[PDB]
């Protein structure tokens, strides 16, 4: 019935916005990383650690969104 037709729509909108948010967030963050690695070769191993430290918080909410999208799609169905 109608329930599943709207619930696939709901999961779709939630994971789509999650995808845009996460991907562009890490896109900007990584862009500053690469420019910071460009000029000086010394600290690639250092910035690439601060990169993960921050990239964790970028992915905080979008994986709430993805978890709940998968939850809707396979368990609310």
């Amino acid at each position: 019935n109608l329930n599943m037709d709207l619930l696939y729509m709901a999961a779709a909108v939630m994971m789509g916005l999650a995808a845009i948010g996460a991907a562009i967030g890490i896109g900007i963050l990584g862009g500053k990383f690469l420019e910071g690695a460009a000029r000086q070769p010394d600290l690639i191993p250092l910035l690439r650690t601060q990169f993960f430290i921050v990239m964790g918080l970028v992915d905080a909410i979008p994986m709430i969104a993805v978890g709940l999208g998968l939850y809707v799609m396979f368990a609310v169905a």
């Binding site: 000029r39 000086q40 070769p41 010394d42």
Partner: protein
């Protein structure tokens, strides 16, 4: 003239422009490359002008 020694000196003629091809080789510049404010070429021009002034002095 060149003050080679306390006891001896010699007259000389040396080219200051165009900039002579002094060896001046290093590759450590990769580690510390200058952030050119405002521009690289403007800074380079001021540096060359100062260098000619310095060599004359």
């Amino acid at each position: 003239n060149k003050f080679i020694n306390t006891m001896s000196q010699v007259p000389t003629i040396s080219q200051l422009l165009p900039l002579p091809a002094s060896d001046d080789d290093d590759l450590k510049h990769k580690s510390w490359d200058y952030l050119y404010e405002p521009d690289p070429k403007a800074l380079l021009d001021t540096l060359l002008r100062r260098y000619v002034e310095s060599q004359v002095y």
